[PDB]
Curated annotation (Swiss-Prot):
Changing K167Q: In R10-3; matures to the red-emitting state with excitation and emission maxima at 555 and 585 nm, respectively. Contains a chromophore consisting of modified amino acid residues. Maturation of the chromophore requires nothing other than molecular oxygen. Green fluorescent protein has been engineered to produce a vast number of variously colored mutants, fusion proteins, and biosensors. Further generation of mutants led to more stable proteins (at 37 degrees Celsius for example) with brighter fluorescence and longer fluorescence lifetimes. Gene3D superfamilies: Green fluorescent protein. GO terms for biological process: bioluminescence; generation of precursor metabolites and energy. Photocytes. This is Green fluorescent protein. Changing I172T: In P11; increases fluorescence at 475 nm excitation and at warmer temperatures such as 37 degrees Celsius. In Esmerald; leads to brighter fluorescence. In VisGreen; leads to brighter fluorescence.
């Protein structure tokens, strides 16, 4: 059960009670290599918990799987009760929100992404387009020099009142196979798809933990992702 004095909080919390099925679709194009990814799994916002398996449906993924983790559903974050009035992501549901990013891989190319996150029936759907340009053919991305792992990370969320949405910018660190690190500097904005009211948050952050694995029975190119996201940074 859920029980909040704000009916707008109640509306979003009710959509994310229990376990929610997730579908992810990504059509990408990086330096002229077209590819698609399909993902399926479940989210349990009560615990900030996501379990997803992604398949490259065009063959071999032309970029490293870790580079797509942030692109491939922050509505499943756990917002503490005393912060639920700051949960933009659930408040935009079920009509959804647009998530847009530019991801600058330092000394390399950049990803431009646009996604619509919304419910289709009971299923939470993340449909994405990605364009990657100016990548080095022998760089860490197109050369597949990134390790298959991921680090824990905090992203700070700010309101974007001009756009009735939010924005964030943050740096992801990708381990390179020779010990060093590839930086991926993310700029992010989110806006509601509908014109109904949303919750615009005070400044806070999301604390993320991600674990990547492989399905030993899966011959297609794939990534198994376990992710926890918790909102923080506002006191009681």
């Amino acid at each position: 059960h859920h029980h909040h004095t704000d009916p707008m909080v109640s509306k979003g919390e009710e959509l994310f009670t229990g376990v929610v099925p997730i579908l992810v679709e990504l059509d990408g194009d990086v330096n002229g290599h077209k590819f698609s990814v399909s993902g399926e799994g479940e989210g349990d916002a009560t615990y900030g918990k996501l379990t997803l398996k992604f398949i490259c449906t065009t063959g071999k993924l032309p970029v490293p799987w870790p580079t797509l983790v942030t692109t491939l559903v922050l509505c499943f974050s756990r917002y503490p009760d005393h912060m639920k009035q700051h949960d933009f992501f659930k408040s935009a549901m079920p009509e959804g929100y647009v998530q847009e990013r530019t991801i600058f891989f330092k000394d390399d190319g950049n990803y431009k992404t646009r996604a619509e996150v919304k419910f289709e029936g009971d299923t939470l759907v993340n449909r994405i387009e990605l364009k990657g340009i100016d990548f080095k053919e022998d760089g860490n991305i197109l050369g597949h020099k990134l390790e298959y792992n991921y680090n824990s990370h905090n992203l700070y969320i700010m309101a974007d009142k001009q756009k009735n949405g939010i924005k964030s910018n943050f740096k992801i660190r990708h381990n390179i196979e020779d010990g060093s690190v590839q930086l991926a500097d993310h700029y992010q904005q989110n806006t509601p798809i509908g014109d109904g009211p949303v919750l615009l948050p005070d400044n806070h952050y999301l604390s993320t933990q991600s674990k990547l694995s492989k399905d030993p029975n899966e011959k297609r190119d794939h990534m198994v992702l376990l992710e926890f996201v918790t909102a923080a940074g506002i006191t009681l």
